[PDB]
Design a protein around this nucleic acid. Structure first.
Ligand code: ZN
Length: 252
DNA sequence: GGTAGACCAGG
DNA sequence: CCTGGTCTACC
């Protein structure tokens, strides 16, 4: 899921688990657990803790318990559901948190690509994978000024910059391409080649792209199709070693 | 320190 | 062999 879908998950999942006390944690694919390294330590420390909150940082979900925070990344196919302990698990269920009321928070992931880290709450923000994560795109912490400062420093293309998670949280290939199209900027442009005007415009489009979604594509996956704003065929190349979609007319 | 890109597994 | 987000590991 993209950031906005993750936010939707955070919102709808919270009431379904808040106030629930963990009685057991069952792990069927240990590699998902990245911290503590030993999945057994992971399971044992969570038992007895009550879910108190659920926050989002970038595309990470941060489950708040009594003492610990669980940092969860769904990656490609990860999904959470709350269901009865009495019913059969759905296919590809790799982690289950069992609550004392007989319900369960289940993590499914056909790809097995998702990750989980647990730390004492007060440590979560200064350890991987949250450490160094850039500002929320919809926060005043993410500003044209912040953006401009990073652009000037680097020899990187603008796309490479926006894909950098220390720059801003939750911007993947899709939103980068879309934001760059909406800002009229070619992805292969050097980040340092962007004018202050282009920086402002880009920041604005980024925020709008994320903001609107947290509530139709122009270029992503539309190569060979007419651009929706000028009709020029959308093209696809490789920038920052990535599948990059752009309009050769709208973007400069 | 700044950077590209290596890798979680399976469709 | 391919996707990708991002933490790692290259110099
Ligand atoms: Zn166009």
């Amino acid at each position: 899921p993209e950031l906005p879908e993750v936010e939707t998950i955070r919102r709808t999942l919270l009431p379904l688990i808040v106030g629930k006390t963990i009685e057991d944690v069952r792990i069927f694919w240990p590699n998902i657990i990245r911290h503590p390294r030993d999945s057994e330590a992971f399971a044992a420390r969570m038992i007895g803790q009550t879910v108190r909150g659920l926050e989002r940082r970038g595309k990470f979900l941060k489950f708040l318990l009594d003492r610990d925070a669980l940092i969860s990344h769904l990656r490609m196919e990860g999904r959470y559901a709350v269901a009865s302990a009495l019913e059969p698990l759905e296919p590809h269920t790799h982690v289950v948190f069992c609550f004392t009321d007989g319900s369960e928070l289940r993590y499914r992931d056909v790809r097995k690509f998702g990750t989980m880290h647990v730390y004492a709450k007060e440590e979560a923000d200064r350890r991987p994978p949250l450490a160094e994560l850039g500002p929320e795109p919809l926060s005043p912490a993410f500003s044209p000024a912040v953006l401009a400062e990073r652009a000037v420093k680097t020899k990187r293309s603008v796309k490479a910059l926006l894909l950098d998670c220390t720059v801003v949280a939750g911007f993947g290939n899709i939103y980068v391409d879309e934001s760059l199209f909406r800002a009229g900027i070619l992805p292969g442009r050097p980040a340092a080649s962007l004018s202050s005007k282009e920086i402002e415009r880009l920041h604005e489009e980024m925020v709008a792209t994320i903001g609107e979604a947290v509530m139709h594509l122009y270029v992503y996956g539309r190569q060979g199709n007419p651009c929706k704003r000028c009709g020029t065929p959308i093209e696809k190349t490789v920038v920052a070693g990535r599948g990059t979609h752009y309009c050769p007319r709208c973007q400069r």
